[PDB]
C-alpha cells in the first residue's frame, strides 16, 4: 500500500523525476491539515459500531426481504456475516482516510470482492445501500453534524476530508 | 512503500483493528519530522546534478584503476552510466526523504543490487566511495539546516550500510 507521499513518489518515478516543487507544496498542505485528518479518523473509529449497525439495520429497514427465508441476512449466521462485512469495509476506508490514499482500500479489500459476492449470492444492490448509508453516517461524524452525538473539535472547515471519505465509500459502491 | 503511515496501518490490518491512539500518535510524529526531511528533499532536488557530479568524480578519483581496460570504467559510455547509477540512488534518497522511510531505497534500488553488481563486475566499494563523499561533503548551515543534515546524512548511511 501507498500513502499520500508514496503516491507522489510513484508518480514522480514514472517520469524518472525528483519530486516537483509543486508536489512538495501540496504535501506541505497535507501536513498542514494533519491534525484535522486525525480528528476525522478519530470521529469515525470512535463511532464504528454505531455506523455499521445503523447502516445494516437501515439496509434491512428499506428492504425487509433480506430477512425473509432465502434472503441473505436470514439466519443469525448470515446477519452476523453482513455485520462483519460492514465493519471490514469501514475499517479499510478508515485506513484510506488515515493514509491519504485509496491504495489499501483497493488492494486489500475491494480486489475480487465483486467476484466473491457473485459467487456467494450476496445482493450487491443492497451491499451498496448499506455502504451509502455508512457514507452519510461517516461524513456526518466528520463534519460533526450527527444528530444524537457530537465530538468537541475546534472550529474549522472539514469539508475536503468529508469529500475524501465519501470518495472512498463511492470506490466501494463502484467495485460491485 | 515502507513508512510511518504504511507500517502502522499494516500492523493494524494484520490484527483486524481500526486505527487507535498508537496509530494517530505515529502519524503525528510524521507531521513533526516532516518539515526538515522535506527541507533536505528540496535542497537535494534543487542541486541534484552538482551533487551527482562531485560524487562520481570522487568515486573515480579514489579508484582510478577502474578506468583500465576490462574495468567498469573502460569506456565513456560506462563511466557515464556510473554517474547515472549515482543519480538513481540520489533520486531514491529524494523519495526516501519525501515518504519519510526507506521504502523507495529498499524496493527500487537495494533489492536486486548485490546480484546485479556481482554479475556486471561493479565493485561495491565505488558506490560506497561516492555516498561517503557526499555525506562528508555536506555542510551545516551552508548546505541545509541541522535537522535536515541529520535526515540526509541518515539516508546516505542507510544506503552505505546496504553495501557492506
Amino acid at each position, epitope marked *: 500500500m501507498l500513502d499520500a507521499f508514496s503516491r507522489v513518489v510513484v508518480n514522480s518515478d514514472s517520469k*524518472a523525476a525528483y519530486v516537483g516543487g509543486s508536489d512538495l507544496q501540496a504535501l506541505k498542505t497535507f501536513i498542514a491539515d494533519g491534525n484535522k485528518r486525525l480528528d476525522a479518523v478519530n470521529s469515525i473509529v470512535s463511532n464504528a459500531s454505531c455506523i455499521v449497525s445503523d447502516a445494516v439495520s437501515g439496509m434491512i429497514c428499506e428492504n425487509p426481504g433480506l430477512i425473509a427465508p432465502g434472503g441473505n441476512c436470514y439466519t443469525n449466521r448470515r446477519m452476523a456475516a453482513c455485520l462483519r462485512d460492514g465493519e471490514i469495509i469501514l475499517r479499510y476506508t478508515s485506513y484510506a482516510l488515515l493514509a491519504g490514499d485509496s491504495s489499501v482500500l483497493e488492494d486489500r479489500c475491494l480486489n475480487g470482492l465483486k467476484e466473491t459476492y457473485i459467487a456467494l449470492g450476496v445482493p450487491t444492490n443492497s451491499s451498496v445501500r448499506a455502504v451509502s448509508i455508512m457514507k452519510s453516517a461517516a461524513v456526518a461524524f466528520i463534519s460533526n453534524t450527527a444528530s444524537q452525538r457530537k465530538m468537541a473539535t475546534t472550529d474549522g472547515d472539514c469539508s475536503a476530508l468529508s469529500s475524501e471519505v465519501a470518495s472512498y465509500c463511492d470506490k466501494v459502491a463502484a467495485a460491485i | 512503500m515502507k513508512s510511518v503511515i504504511t507500517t502502522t496501518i499494516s500492523a493494524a490490518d494484520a490484527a483486524g483493528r481500526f486505527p487507535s491512539s498508537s496509530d494517530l500518535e505515529s502519524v503525528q510524529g510524521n507531521i513533526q519530522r516532516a518539515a526538515s526531511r522535506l527541507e533536505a528533499a528540496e535542497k537535494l532536488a534543487g542541486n541534484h546534478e552538482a551533487v551527482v557530479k562531485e560524487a562520481g568524480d570522487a568515486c573515480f578519483a579514489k579508484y582510478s584503476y577502474l578506468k583500465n581496460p576490462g574495468e567498469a570504467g573502460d569506456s565513456q559510455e560506462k*563511466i557515464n552510466k556510473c554517474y547515472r547509477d549515482i543519480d538513481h540512488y540520489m533520486r531514491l534518497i529524494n523519495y526516501s526523504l519525501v515518504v519519510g522511510g526507506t521504502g523507495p531505497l529498499d524496493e527500487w534500488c537495494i533489492a536486486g543490487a548485490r546480484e546485479v553488481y556481482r554479475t556486471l563486475n561493479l565493485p561495491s566499494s565505488s558506490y560506497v566511495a561516492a555516498f561517503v563523499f557526499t555525506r562528508d561533503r555536506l555542510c551545516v548551515p551552508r548546505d541545509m539546516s541541522a535537522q535536515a543534515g541529520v535526515e540526509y546524512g541518515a539516508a546516505l548511511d542507510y544506503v552505505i550500510n546496504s553495501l557492506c
Partner: T-cell receptor, first 112, second 107 residues
Framework: TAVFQTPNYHVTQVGNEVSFNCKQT?????MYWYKQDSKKLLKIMFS???????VNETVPRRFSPQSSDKAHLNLRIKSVEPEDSAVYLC???????????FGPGTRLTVLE | QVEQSPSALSLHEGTSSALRCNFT?????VQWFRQNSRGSLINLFY???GTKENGRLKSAFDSKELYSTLHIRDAQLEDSGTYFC???????????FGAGTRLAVSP
C-alpha cells in the same frame, strides 16, 4: 560522429513559422539548443536527456522543442519575431562526463 | 559570469600570445573552442584543473583560482578565428560562454 543540422540558412517574414532539425550520429544521450547573438555570444536555450527536457532557460512561449529519439532534437518557432534573428547551434554530449560537440548551425534572418 | 580577454588580437605570423578567461563561481571543467569562418565551433580542449597541450596550443585551468588560459605558440595563418572558453561553473547543468577573442594572423 558529427552533429548534423538543417537548414543552413533561412529567411522568413515576421509571423511565419520556422523549424530547424538536428540529429547526431555520436553515441550520445544529451542534446542542446544554443542561440548565438550578433555580438558573437552564445547562450543555452534548451537541454534534453533521453526524451526528458532537463534545462529550459526562460525562452518565450513561441520557441518549442520536440525530441523523438535521443539522437534527434528539433525546434519549431511559431509567430517568428524580428529580434529572433541569430544563429541556432545544436550541440550534443554525454550527460555526466564529456565535452560538448557542436553542429554547423542555422542562421535565421527575420525580415520586416 | 565569465569574462574573456583580450576581445581582439592581431598577431604576426610567428608571434606567440595568450587568452585568459576568468570565472566568478566554482567551475568543474573548461572547454576551449575556435570558431571558423563558416561558423562551426571546433573543439580545442576540454580539461579539469590541469594542463593539456595540442600542437601549438596549450591550455591550463586553475579551479581554486577560477581562471583558465589558452596559449598560442608560433602563430600560423590557419589559427585565425574566434576563440571561446566555456565553463561548467555554477550548478554544473549548463555551459557559460565568454564574449570571444577575435584572433587574426597576418602573413
Amino acid at each position: 560522429t558529427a552533429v548534423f543540422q538543417t537548414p543552413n540558412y533561412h529567411v522568413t517574414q515576421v509571423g511565419n513559422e520556422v523549424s530547424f532539425n538536428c540529429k547526431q550520429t555520436l553515441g550520445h544521450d544529451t542534446m542542446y539548443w544554443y542561440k548565438q547573438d550578433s555580438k558573437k555570444l552564445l547562450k543555452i536555450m534548451f537541454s534534453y536527456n533521453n526524451k526528458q527536457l532537463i534545462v529550459n532557460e526562460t525562452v518565450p512561449r513561441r520557441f518549442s522543442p520536440q525530441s523523438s529519439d535521443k539522437a534527434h532534437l528539433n525546434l519549431r518557432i511559431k509567430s517568428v519575431e524580428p529580434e529572433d534573428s541569430a544563429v541556432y547551434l545544436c550541440a550534443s554530449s554525454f550527460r555526466w562526463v564529456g565535452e560538448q560537440y557542436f553542429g554547423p548551425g542555422t542562421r535565421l534572418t527575420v525580415l520586416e | 559570469q565569465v569574462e574573456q580577454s583580450p576581445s581582439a588580437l592581431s598577431l604576426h605570423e610567428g608571434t606567440s600570445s595568450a587568452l585568459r578567461c576568468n570565472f566568478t563561481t566554482t567551475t568543474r571543467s573548461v572547454q576551449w573552442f575556435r570558431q571558423n569562418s563558416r561558423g562551426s565551433l571546433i573543439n580545442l580542449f576540454y580539461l579539469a584543473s590541469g594542463t593539456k597541450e595540442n600542437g601549438r596550443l596549450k591550455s591550463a585551468f586553475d579551479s581554486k583560482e577560477l581562471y583558465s588560459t589558452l596559449h598560442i605558440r608560433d602563430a600560423q595563418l590557419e589559427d585565425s578565428g574566434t576563440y571561446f572558453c566555456a565553463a561548467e561553473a555554477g550548478s554544473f547543468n549548463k555551459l557559460t560562454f565568454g564574449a570571444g577573442t577575435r584572433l587574426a594572423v597576418s602573413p
